[PDB]
């Protein structure tokens, strides 16, 4: 598990980052398994697997895209109207689907980073800068229909292209928490 | 189920001499423990199996023996050993302890102190009387105080409240209380407690009267 | 070992029976320019207690001058008691 | 430092019940099995109960077999002795005891202070205190006659306990369904009868406090 | 995941006092990879072993374990210990075993004095079932499912002799390392502190 | 540790009806007893892995008639058929021909090693049922004995314990 | 015959001019290696005596 | 886990892998070992977006053997009082 | 790191090398790090050689994002004394660089 | 049946005089006890033939001084000399150098096999006597421990018995 979110009104674009820090307590951070796993090793350099699941109302349009760090993007973990446009979102790379055809997307998360490698456990001002490596953000449309919930899921898994560095002492019993 | 007895019952020993008691089993026993009941507190870590003392116990003591009869041999008698010991086996279902050896301090002979008082005026309004002979600051504890009540000898109703040997001046104390009825109290005059000390050949007669004052 | 009691050191053969025949005979110097190694030793270790005893530069006393031998039980307790 | 502090006891009529307890500190009792050791007033101790680390193995002797019940809790680190069918043979002092393990037998290390259970049914009686006065020398032993109380704990106090060099507190003697003592103080002739010598007799069970002063009659 | 497991990490702590009796039980240890009890007040944290975090993410475990009892005495302390292995489960009345009855079970003697501290005591797989389950996910005890393949008891094989100008206690640390370890069927469970 | 141990002595009578279970026992539990030499090896060693050897000897007089069954059952006789017991490795008995049979079965158990202090279920359960009724006339004796000689095969020992 | 080797007491280590000799020594452990940078973030020579 | 929708396909053919710490499970047992030494798996389903206009929602669960398992010690079959259907 | 205890004391220390910070690392699991322990029985000199563990390749002195290494020393065993034994023992850390590179000269200090 | 078994725990004190016998025990009888695994092999087998392995470990503080003796005596200390005990295979103790010795002696007995139920005489008798007095000053601890680890070597078993 990574995160989950719902919808309230029309075209409420959602934006969540992936932060490997242990200071960011869940739901706004790392949940159960990934909180322990992203603090066992010091540095990280490589991609990830993203499997999203769409469950709920029907006849809803949607679009998912990637945005690297060090660019202009909307507010993290806050569902609001997007200040961005269709030229900035589609020029970076995106997919297009419908919530009636398949309802699930298995997508890679490529390594778009200017720095060498990200590190999970940090403190100070470098924890919010030298840890993040990606951002997955979703905009919806054709909302809504007759009253029914619309919840999205976001899961993560490691890929065979990444490596690991400098084995670290594991998390104590007061940090291994779930959502 | 088998009974552990102890052959010294009451022992009085001088400072600096050899003391030895015996927990005599009536069966073959392997390892017989020992305890120390100080006057007012509970027994603690004192002696385990036969010759293994505790850590806070003084190293001047000795324990030995094989088979039935075991002995806790004291090599140096001191002042802090005025306490009662026990002895225990660990081989049956009903674990019964020893009889208890009250080892005290043999100090030299000291004269008894007599302050024999009448009962209160409040007790005669209660219909009773307790003729108490105060007996303090003396060795030995073994004293046979008989009552000379108009030339008679009455050992009935003689209440003997016993403290132990005092831990400061090594003296004993005795209460010698005669419970009487009011009409029983108002019949006699001579109210005499007398001391039986091993140095006092004649008994020290210190008495009071009822008709006096 | 048939039993399985292993140790970090080696126990040697202690208290060897009949170390010497008591005839005083030949079987130069016993000690001398060669230094005495059995002068100082350690007796708690039975391995180093096996060292040859000497403290003085010596030589042979010589051959004994009685033909019979009086240091075995076969010819000592042979005389009846 | 280890404090195996008991709690409980009191006055239960014969045929009643009682549940004892012993608090524990400075170590975890989850290892060592505990024991209740009963002190008769005739100085004859008795080993009556022992249960192990878990609540399975109980070692009951011939006497209490079917009368009492020992219990423990490893998380609360206390003790429990549920007693029933009480009688005069169990009118005695109780002690919680820790059992430790020796090479061929077992052994007791640390014992507690002790709780009083008197299994008898008279009424609860507050003590009656009578002064003792003569009808001379530089040393006159006075006294108060604390007569007539059944519950055993009582405390005679001499001027807030300030005369303790000569206070000869004599123990209680059971006589005519009443435990009776005669507390005594040794007060010199310079203080008595010139100053105040008053016995503060306090009794916790019946909740009474008696103040009596010896004056010469 | 072998990099975190076989490295010796501290799991417990027990001293060796001099005010104890010959054969008195000091500390009983459920032998498992799930073993940790230490914590810290400042900061608010409960100290975890590197072996337990690897194994708390599995339903089953199988493999040997190596304890490392490092003492910190002076050069003048003495006495011995006995590291007996009592097998079975985590729930018996283990504190009733006589010291000579522990001589039947496999064990290891050790001298306290010397210039080598750590005795690497290895735990064999004494078990009735080949796969040993993570029962700590459940909250109800059940016969048949266990977590400990044995229980360690450090006995007071001899007492502590010492000079006057040092203390009367020798602290023994408990590391935790493992060999031939095997785990499958993953889960998620945050373990609790075993307060024995 | 491998020698024939008598574990039970019953007596098959004439008043028993058809398909009546004569013996119902545990082969492993009856070998766990103080009065045998296999107690001396299994008391210090907890884990156990063993095969089961069975020999059963009965003694009828030849003026009787009837037959028995001796099957080896893993676990329990929960819902097995009485009439389909010959699929099991069995040995039958007859008043005509023989009086000694033997059965060798392997270790059939959900696990590999065995725990003596708390078993999940019995490993083997030797069953003896009346295969034919025992009839007599007048004067022929109305009793005949029955004995079960069992022993372990291929024993392993692992994981010594300090407790008894 | 087995022999457990122990730690050496004397050690002569240090720098060019700063020279230290210790009586209580221990083995200097070493992990990893000095890593070079293939995508050079500095295309010129490093600071040295010859260029400064 | 898997993730689907009841409008796309409406059926799942899935393996049931052997996740067990013990050696092998046994069918016919009694006592306390029957509820412990027999079970080997658990299939569990959570739903959402329920409900719509009133219509039943029934799931089915079938089993079949795979070619990776084996069999041991042929047992006598079930009697006629046990072969029952739902 | 060199320390100097008197041999009438007892106790031990720990010396681990930590990248970044001691944010949520276990105190009891510090031996996974390249460490060196201390003892009042045997030794008083240890050495640790660790490589450059950092999110980037080069280092900026004027504004660091986070500290690269953080040497930690924690009490591994308590230091006990009796009567007359000295109640202090010193501690010193000797550190130096290895395999230094220099790039990009600046005019400012 | 061949593993070191602690048989006795005493404590050598400072108040002991010269040539005082610290330990007096039977090595064979203390190995005959319920709390050992060698009880499990010797309970069914009556006859015994064995060699004696001895290892004794003591622990003095180095601010004491004195020495001990550890000899192996066949039968009894009837009329043997205290000063001539080094003819026996012994091992001495010292507060200066060492604290571990070992002694390997063979089976010295008037017969070949051994009877546990009624021995004629004890086979070996381990003796420990004060070789030098243990002196202390002020503050040095007045106790030091003593332990005897004994085991059998080269055991034979003959003639099984039904009784315990």
Short mmCIF file of C-alpha atoms in Angstrom, two decimals, chain I residues 3-108:
data_model
loop_
_atom_site.label_atom_id
_atom_site.label_comp_id
_atom_site.label_asym_id
_atom_site.label_seq_id
_atom_site.Cartn_x
_atom_site.Cartn_y
_atom_site.Cartn_z
CA UNK I 3 40.56 6.22 25.26
CA UNK I 4 42.44 5.61 28.51
CA UNK I 5 40.75 3.76 31.40
CA UNK I 6 42.36 2.68 34.63
CA UNK I 7 42.17 -1.13 35.04
CA UNK I 8 40.23 -0.88 38.34
CA UNK I 9 37.13 0.23 36.42
CA UNK I 10 34.76 -1.72 34.18
CA UNK I 11 32.48 -0.92 31.28
CA UNK I 12 32.38 -0.55 27.54
CA UNK I 13 31.58 1.96 24.82
CA UNK I 14 30.39 1.97 21.19
CA UNK I 15 31.74 3.95 18.22
CA UNK I 16 29.57 3.76 15.10
CA UNK I 17 29.69 5.80 11.90
CA UNK I 18 26.25 7.06 10.88
CA UNK I 19 25.33 8.63 7.51
CA UNK I 20 23.08 11.68 7.79
CA UNK I 21 21.51 11.54 11.26
CA UNK I 22 20.38 9.25 14.09
CA UNK I 23 16.74 9.81 13.05
CA UNK I 24 15.09 6.44 13.67
CA UNK I 25 17.97 3.97 13.91
CA UNK I 26 17.93 1.36 16.66
CA UNK I 27 20.38 1.72 19.53
CA UNK I 28 20.51 -2.07 19.93
CA UNK I 29 21.08 -2.70 16.19
CA UNK I 30 24.09 -0.39 15.75
CA UNK I 31 26.50 -3.26 15.03
CA UNK I 32 25.22 -3.49 11.44
CA UNK I 33 27.06 -0.20 10.95
CA UNK I 34 30.86 -0.42 10.67
CA UNK I 35 31.65 0.10 14.32
CA UNK I 36 34.38 -0.48 16.87
CA UNK I 37 33.73 -1.40 20.50
CA UNK I 38 35.71 -0.52 23.61
CA UNK I 39 36.52 -2.65 26.67
CA UNK I 40 38.25 -2.15 30.02
CA UNK I 41 39.76 -5.64 29.67
CA UNK I 42 41.63 -5.93 26.37
CA UNK I 43 42.15 -2.97 24.07
CA UNK I 44 42.05 0.82 23.85
CA UNK I 45 42.72 1.58 20.13
CA UNK I 46 40.34 0.86 17.24
CA UNK I 47 40.09 2.16 13.68
CA UNK I 48 37.22 2.51 11.18
CA UNK I 49 37.52 3.20 7.44
CA UNK I 50 34.26 4.18 5.72
CA UNK I 51 33.62 5.57 2.22
CA UNK I 52 31.84 8.73 1.08
CA UNK I 53 28.13 8.13 1.71
CA UNK I 54 26.21 11.11 0.33
CA UNK I 55 23.29 11.79 -2.01
CA UNK I 56 25.59 13.66 -4.43
CA UNK I 57 29.19 13.38 -5.62
CA UNK I 58 30.83 16.68 -4.69
CA UNK I 59 30.41 18.70 -1.49
CA UNK I 60 29.56 22.35 -0.90
CA UNK I 61 31.07 23.97 2.20
CA UNK I 62 29.00 27.17 2.29
CA UNK I 63 25.51 25.61 2.45
CA UNK I 64 25.29 21.88 3.17
CA UNK I 65 21.99 20.08 2.71
CA UNK I 66 22.72 17.62 5.56
CA UNK I 67 25.84 16.33 7.38
CA UNK I 68 27.64 13.58 5.49
CA UNK I 69 28.86 11.48 8.43
CA UNK I 70 27.98 11.75 12.12
CA UNK I 71 30.30 9.95 14.52
CA UNK I 72 28.32 8.58 17.46
CA UNK I 73 29.61 7.35 20.82
CA UNK I 74 27.09 5.84 23.23
CA UNK I 75 27.42 4.17 26.63
CA UNK I 76 27.52 0.43 25.92
CA UNK I 77 28.07 -0.49 29.58
CA UNK I 78 27.99 1.69 32.69
CA UNK I 79 31.29 2.75 34.28
CA UNK I 80 31.35 1.51 37.89
CA UNK I 81 33.88 2.28 40.64
CA UNK I 82 34.30 1.40 44.30
CA UNK I 83 36.26 3.49 46.82
CA UNK I 84 39.51 5.14 45.79
CA UNK I 85 39.33 4.28 42.08
CA UNK I 86 39.34 7.43 39.94
CA UNK I 87 35.98 8.60 38.60
CA UNK I 88 37.15 9.93 35.22
CA UNK I 89 38.62 8.59 31.99
CA UNK I 90 39.43 10.56 28.86
CA UNK I 91 38.26 10.31 25.25
CA UNK I 92 39.75 11.59 21.99
CA UNK I 93 38.78 11.37 18.31
CA UNK I 94 41.52 11.49 15.65
CA UNK I 95 40.00 11.97 12.19
CA UNK I 96 41.42 12.64 8.74
CA UNK I 97 40.38 12.70 5.09
CA UNK I 98 41.21 10.01 2.51
CA UNK I 99 41.21 10.28 -1.31
CA UNK I 100 40.53 14.01 -1.67
CA UNK I 101 39.64 15.71 -4.96
CA UNK I 102 39.56 19.46 -5.66
CA UNK I 103 37.50 21.11 -8.40
CA UNK I 104 36.29 24.58 -9.32
CA UNK I 105 38.38 27.30 -7.66
CA UNK I 106 36.53 30.26 -6.12
CA UNK I 107 37.75 33.85 -5.59
CA UNK I 108 35.84 34.30 -2.34
#
